[PDB]
Amino acid sequence: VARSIAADHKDLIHDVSFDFHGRRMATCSSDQSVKVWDKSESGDWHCTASWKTHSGSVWRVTWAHPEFGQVLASCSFDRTAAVWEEIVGSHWVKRTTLVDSRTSVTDVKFAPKHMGLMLATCSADGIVRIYEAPDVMNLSQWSLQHEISCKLSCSCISWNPSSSRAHSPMIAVGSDDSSPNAMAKVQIFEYNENTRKYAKAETLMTVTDPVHDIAFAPNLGRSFHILAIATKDVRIFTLKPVRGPTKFEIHIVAQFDNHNSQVWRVSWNITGTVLASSGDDGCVRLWKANYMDNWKCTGILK
Amino acid sequence: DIACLLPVHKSLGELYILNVNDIQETCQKNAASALLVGRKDLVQVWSLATVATDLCLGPKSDPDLETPWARHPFGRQLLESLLAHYCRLRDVQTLAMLCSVFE
Amino acid sequence: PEGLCYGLFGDLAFAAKESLVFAGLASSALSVFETGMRWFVDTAERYALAGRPLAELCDHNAKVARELGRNQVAQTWTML
Numbered sequence A: 001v002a003r004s005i006a007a008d009h010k011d012l013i014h015d016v017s018f019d020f021h022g023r024r025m026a027t028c029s030s031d032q033s034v035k036v037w038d039k040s041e042s043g044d045w046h047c048t049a050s051w052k053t054h055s056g057s058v059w060r061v062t063w064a065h066p067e068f069g070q071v072l073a074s075c076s077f078d079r080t081a082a083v084w085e086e087i088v089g090s091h092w093v094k095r096t097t098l099v100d101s102r103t104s105v106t107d108v109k110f111a112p113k114h115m116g117l118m119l120a121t122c123s124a125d126g127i128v129r130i131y132e133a134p135d136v137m138n139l140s141q142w143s144l145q146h147e148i149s150c151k152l153s154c155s156c157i158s159w160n161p162s163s164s165r166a167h168s169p170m171i172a173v174g175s176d177d178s179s180p181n182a183m184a185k186v187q188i189f190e191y192n193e194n195t196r197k198y199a200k201a202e203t204l205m206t207v208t209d210p211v212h213d214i215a216f217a218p219n220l221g222r223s224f225h226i227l228a229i230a231t232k233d234v235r236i237f238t239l240k241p242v243r244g245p246t247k248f249e250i251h252i253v254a255q256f257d258n259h260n261s262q263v264w265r266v267s268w269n270i271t272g273t274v275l276a277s278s279g280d281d282g283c284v285r286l287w288k289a290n291y292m293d294n295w296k297c298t299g300i301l302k
Numbered sequence B: 001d002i003a004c005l006l007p008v009h010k011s012l013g014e015l016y017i018l019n020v021n022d023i024q025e026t027c028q029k030n031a032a033s034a035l036l037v038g039r040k041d042l043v044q045v046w047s048l049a050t051v052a053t054d055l056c057l058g059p060k061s062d063p064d065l066e067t068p069w070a071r072h073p074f075g076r077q078l079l080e081s082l083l084a085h086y087c088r089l090r091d092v093q094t095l096a097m098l099c100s101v102f103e
Numbered sequence C: 001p002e003g004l005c006y007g008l009f010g011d012l013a014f015a016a017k018e019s020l021v022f023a024g025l026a027s028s029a030l031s032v033f034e035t036g037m038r039w040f041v042d043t044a045e046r047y048a049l050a051g052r053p054l055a056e057l058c059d060h061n062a063k064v065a066r067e068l069g070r071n072q073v074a075q076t077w078t079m080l
Helices: B010-015 B025-037 B041-052 B076-086 B092-101 C038-045 C054-066 C071-079
Strands: A013-018 A024-029 A033-039 A045-052 A058-063 A071-076 A081-085 A093-098 A105-110 A119-123 A127-132 A143-149 A154-158 A170-175 A186-192 A197-203 A213-216 A225-230 A234-241 A248-256 A263-268 A275-279 A284-289 A295-301 C003-006 C011-017 C028-034
Touching: A013 A058, A013 C003, A013 C011, A013 C028, A024 A058, A033 A058, A058 A105, A071 A105, A081 A119, A105 A154, A119 A154, A127 A154, A143 A197, A170 A213, A197 A248, A213 A263, A225 A263, A248 A295, A263 C003, A275 C003, A275 C011, B010 B025, B025 B041, B025 B092, B041 B076, B041 B092, B041 C071, B076 B092, C054 C071
Parallel strands: A154 A213
Antiparallel strands: A013 A024, A024 A033, A033 A045, A058 A071, A071 A081, A081 A093, A105 A119, A119 A127, A127 A143, A154 A170, A170 A186, A186 A197, A213 A225, A225 A234, A234 A248, A263 A275, A275 A284, A284 A295, C003 C011, C011 C028
């Protein structure tokens, strides 16, 4: 089917993010506002709150785990970011502001539960930053723990949602520069317990077109990693651990050009067996793999 | 009459039944016969054969619909392990019936 | 110009520019494609995990799996 919701946004919608329990939704716009929608028994979605956030365009908005309350985050274009919490009820108030950035901020994404309450923000100067909150009941104190330099204009970031104790935390960073030269565009970082510093793990030398979106796949028992890359085409990679930074066996298991245009966004499902892609034509395609480890399309939606 | 020294037995040979049209019956009756003669591992194997060959596990004609029962670890691997076990005792009797029912 | 997210219950959200669906490029259209995990919650609610011997447990679990259309699971329980 196909529903319809009038967002009443004065400008373009730039991001949509569901909550942990699948009952609320948050949107961001270029009109410098963020709205929250809650569903009822009748199935309709109603705009509960709508407030101005920043001074410029807002790019992305993400959610936080419900165990820490009802907390949001928003990277916008005034070189800052904000963390809003609304246990205060029934409006949303600002608990902090991350000012340390010097260029336009592109993406903000939280971290899994098992590593606390952490935030990772990327900038247009090639710098990604990792924050932390020491006491989880005081969201007005954050610290700048780590700092990375990527030598490329960052455009998208993605974590690794694996919960096993045998996988170290990772973070992948993508670039969007369109220089005539041919250099890698996706770089993978890993965290080493002894050195307590993030170090470069591997790079994808086969990727030279600009990358616009990156997303991992929820593990739920698998022993290897699956990565999705949005480019002129749609590519899927597989990283297998081998028996300093850990080495992996990198393979490519998909190169699909059915959109015949640029791919903007990607996303996975809860279990990690279906992927969704968006193109310039305005159509969404879903992909799934059989027992051959061959990925076949399942549905075209418009 | 050195017959107890050989893996094969005459009475089992007389009492066994093999019917193509119905498979569950020609395994339950054989399980009863194996219990009657005195051997128990045959009873367990025949019970596993009853469970593992039902018409409910019929393979589909397309590869993007379901994972075939052959690659479930209780499918081809179980048969291979049982065949390997019974190829050591040189019990050709059980080998023939097993390799025919699963056909 | 577009944003996408996937939901818990199979719901999908998608927004795109008006052109891709003074100037007509200053707005966007928001859509929710209501596309199942009911085989998870229903089997989780009815499973016998303790309190009875193994034989009865396996039979109950096999019947529960059978009444839903999953036959390989039922055969696995019986074989166990």
